[PDB]
Amino acid sequence: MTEYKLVVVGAGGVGKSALTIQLIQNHFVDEYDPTIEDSYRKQVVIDGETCLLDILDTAGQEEYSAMRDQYMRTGEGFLCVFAINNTKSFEDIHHYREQIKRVKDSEDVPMVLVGNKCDLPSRTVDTKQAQDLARSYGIPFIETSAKTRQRVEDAFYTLVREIRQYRLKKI
Ligand SMILES: Nc1nc2c(ncn2[C@@H]2O[C@H](COP(=O)(O)OP(=O)(O)O)[C@@H](O)[C@H]2O)c(=O)[nH]1
Ligand SMILES: [Mg+2]
């Protein structure tokens, strides 16, 4: 059984919790329910490999979190989430990426860019704008909807695949 420690980062309100809960529980949390920062473990088969995913869904970024500091230090791959109807959250992506590189003191960290809420007609971030940002970082870009269950597994499984390739190349 292969472990992958994943960290979901990005601005408040973009759907990090909704994406993680959809993946873990196949449920969509009610729109107005309290979010909480928490970690989740789930055994899953990914490309025929039996995997243990250890996922931290981050929150409360303006106060100390011992768990978040541990997962940022030790996390193996990062899902950088913005919402496609929220330009500020997309324009925040470079700060989240910079935080990750600083903690890892590395320019080469497994990451996937995720544009969530692709079920909303009020899009303000064009798919091609985000694809270009991801291309400039050298990482995959995936558009998701936690609500209509579009590409949720693809987003997380793609990050696992990025970690697997990182490991294979370094050896
Ligand atoms: N329409 C839609 N709303 C979403 C989606 N994902 C999250 N939300 C809503 O967006 C708000 C923020 O979601 P949340 O998971 O709490 O975001 P976090 O703060 O990034 O964890 C909540 O009201 C969610 O119900 C999605 O894919 N589509
Ligand atoms: Mg949350």
Residue numbers in the entry: 1 to 171
Could you give the paper's own sentences about this structure?
These isoforms differ in exon 4, which encodes the final 15 residues of the G-domain and hypervariable regions (HVRs), vital for trafficking and membrane localization. RAS proteins act as binary switches, transitioning between the active [guanosine triphosphate (GTP)–bound] and inactive [guanosine diphosphate (GDP)–bound] forms. We present the structures of both the active and inactive forms of KRAS4a, as well as of the complex between KRAS4a and the primary effector protein RAF1 and compare them to previously reported KRAS4b structures.
To gain structural insights into the active and inactive states of KRAS4a, we solved the crystal structure of both inactive (GDP-bound) and active (GMPPNP-bound) KRAS4a at 1.8 and 1.6 Å, respectively. Although the longest KRAS4a constructs that yielded crystals were from residues 1 to 177, interpretable electron density typically ended around residue 169 or 170. At position 151, the arginine residue in KRAS4a forms hydrogen bonds with neighboring residues (D154 in chain A or Q150 in chain B). At position 167, the longer arginine side chain in KRAS4a enables it to form a salt bridge with the side chain of E76 and a hydrogen bond with the backbone carbonyl of E3. Furthermore, notable differences in surface electrostatics were observed at the helix’s C terminus, which transitions into the HVR. In KRAS4a, a distinct cluster of positive potential (R167 and K170) is separated from a slightly negative potential region by a narrow, uncharged strip, indicated in Fig. 2 (G and H) by the symbols +, −, and N, respectively. The residues with multiple amide peaks include K5-V9 (N-terminal strand β1), G10-G13 (P-loop), S17-I24 (helix α1), and G60, E62, Q70, and M72-G75 (switch II). The corresponding slow exchanging conformations in KRAS4a-GDP suggest a possible allosteric pathway between switches I and II, mediated by β1, the P-loop, and α1 (effector lobe), with possible cross-talk with the C-terminal α5 (allosteric lobe).
